[PDB]
Design a binder for this molecule. Structure first.
Ligand SMILES: c1cc(-c2cnnc(N3CCN(c4ccncc4)CC3)c2)ccn1
Length: 280
């Protein structure tokens, strides 16, 4: 599939660079014809067929196809796609309140009520994705953005679908590996992957929201990955002594090695607490 090949600068003016990962660049921009503001994500193309740098065309096209299908308040909207010799440029909805990662760094830890206000929105977005058989495969605080960080109950959107896949045969078995602290054991073990992997990541996120600490994090990537595979975590009393038993129950039912025994997204919404790359 080919994208718009006019110069993006003919249609948008860019401004501030926003925070991003090592591989893409994200800039605020403004569309000349409407004055509306967006975020432009520049994905570097592969320079040759057997190259390791840049993103393969197949991978870019998968991300664009998934973005085009999704429309939900808790997921980022794709507006347009441009391309040139070096980059594919996604014009995305602007989310200006920063990363949940940076919000958490300011608060240290969240109360159970504050955590559930965020978690409900994450679960609603993941329920939409899983209903479409889309696994995100990279859920973590850096991939969740706040619309406005200055309100008492900030609203959020899931971003960056660069690892997302449609799961139409129940599982995928290929080159899929996210960030070590957040990946499920089946990722660590290079096993077939399905929607269950996202549920594990939600368990990790929930643990971090309540404690400010990462449940499997070791001093090196290999230690973290070994900890994930062994389900080596505990609810440290220093962080969790005053946390409700139901919150611990929720996490415990997500941080389960066997994907078939892990809570699904539908289970998570009915749970009584809620119901109203890899190489150093
Ligand atoms: C504003 C921004 C964005 C946007 C789009 N794509 N990726 C984005 N980042 C967010 C930061 N980031 C990391 C990852 C690792 N370490 C530090 C930061 C993860 C990816 C932001 C979209 C709309 N409005």
């Amino acid at each position: 599939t080919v994208f718009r090949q006019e110069n993006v600068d003919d249609y948008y003016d860019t401004g501030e660079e926003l925070g991003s990962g090592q591989f893409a660049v994200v800039k605020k921009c403004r569309e000349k014809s409407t004055g509306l503001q967006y975020a432009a994500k520049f994905i570097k193309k592969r320079r040759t067929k057997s190259s390791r740098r840049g993103v393969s065309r197949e991978d870019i096209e998968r991300e664009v196809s998934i973005l085009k299908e999704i429309q939900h308040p808790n997921v980022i909207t794709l507006h347009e796609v441009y391309e040139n010799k070096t980059d594919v440029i996604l014009i995305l909805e602007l989310v200006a309140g920063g990363e949940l990662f940076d919000f958490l760094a300011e608060k240290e830890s969240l109360t159970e009520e504050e955590a559930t206000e965020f978690l409900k929105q994450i679960l609603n977005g993941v329920y939409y994705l899983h209903s479409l058989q889309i696994a995100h495969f990279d859920l973590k605080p850096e991939n969740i953005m706040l619309l406005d960080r200055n309100v008492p109950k900030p609203r959020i959107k899931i971003i960056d679908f660069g690892l997302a896949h449609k799961i139409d045969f129940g599982n995928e078995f290929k080159n899929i590996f996210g960030t070590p602290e957040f990946v499920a054991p089946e990722i660590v073990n290079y096993e077939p992957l399905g929607l269950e992997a996202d549920m594990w990541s939600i368990g990790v996120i929930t643990y971090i929201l309540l404690s400010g600490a990462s449940p499997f994090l070791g001093d090196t990537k290999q230690e973290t990955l070994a900890n994930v595979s062994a389900v080596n975590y505990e609810f440290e009393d220093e962080y969790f002594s005053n946390t409700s038993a139901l919150a611990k129950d929720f996490i415990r039912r997500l941080l389960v090695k066997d994907p078939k025994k892990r809570m699904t997204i539908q289970d998570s919404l009915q749970h009584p607490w809620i119901k109203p790359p890899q190489f150093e």
